[PDB]
């Protein structure tokens, strides 16, 4: 019933994500010299360094907000990919599975803790 615990739980999950080779393409912004069409296709860039910085700044109120930005990383990769069998998109799908597997308890515990707080 700790309604602050999500933040360190998210910090540790981001640490795991940064250790994971599959996160390489998603740790920083897209160079438009390398992908000149990227911002034609993608209105709202997002990367794991921006998510970590937002968390560390104290600019997420809940793990739901963090989860929305992480999911945007993945939806951006799905929108940008030229193919469902693109290397970087395939990395996104494995990393998304890993993230969803690990964030589910963080969201459950937060929402339970907040229901207890308001009981």
88 binds ligand Y2V (CB under 6 A): yes
CB closer to ligand Y2V out of 28 and 112: 28
Q: Based on CB atoms, which residue is closest to ligand Y2V, 62 or 90?
A: 90
Q: 3-38 burial, b if ≥16 CB within 10 A, otherwise e?
A: beebbebbeebbeebeebebbebbeeebeeeeeeee
Establish if 86 lies at the interface with ligand Y2V (CB under 6 A): yes
Between CA 115 and CA 86 the distance in angstroms is 42
Query: What is residue 47's three-state secondary structure?
Result: coil
Of 20 and 113, CB closest to ligand Y2V: 20
Does residue 90 bind ligand Y2V (CB under 6 A)?
Answer: no
CB of 106 to ligand Y2V, least distance (A): 24
- Give the total residue count for the chain: 119
CA-based nearest residue to 70, from 108, 39, 103: 103
- In the window 22-81, what residues touch ligand Y2V (CB under 6 A)? 25-28, 30, 34-35, 76-77, 80-81
User: Rule CB under 6 A: which residues touch ligand Y2V?
Assistant: 25-28, 30, 34-35, 76-77, 80-81, 86, 88-89, 92
């Amino acid at each position: 019933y700790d309604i602050q615990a999500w933040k360190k739980q998210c910090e540790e999950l981001l640490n795991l994500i940064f250790q994971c080779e599959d996160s390489e393409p998603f740790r920083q912004p897209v160079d438009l010299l390398e992908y000149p069409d990227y911002r034609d296709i993608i209105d709202t860039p997002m990367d794991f360094a921006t998510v970590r910085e937002t968390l560390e700044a104290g600019n997420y109120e809940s793990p739901m907000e963090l989860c929305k930005d992480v999911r945007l990383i993945f939806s951006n990769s799905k929108a940008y990919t030229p193919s469902k069998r693109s290397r970087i998109y395939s990395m996104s799908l494995r990393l998304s599975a890993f993230f969803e597997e690990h964030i589910s308890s963080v969201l459950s515990d937060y929402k339970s803790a907040l229901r207890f707080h308001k009981r």
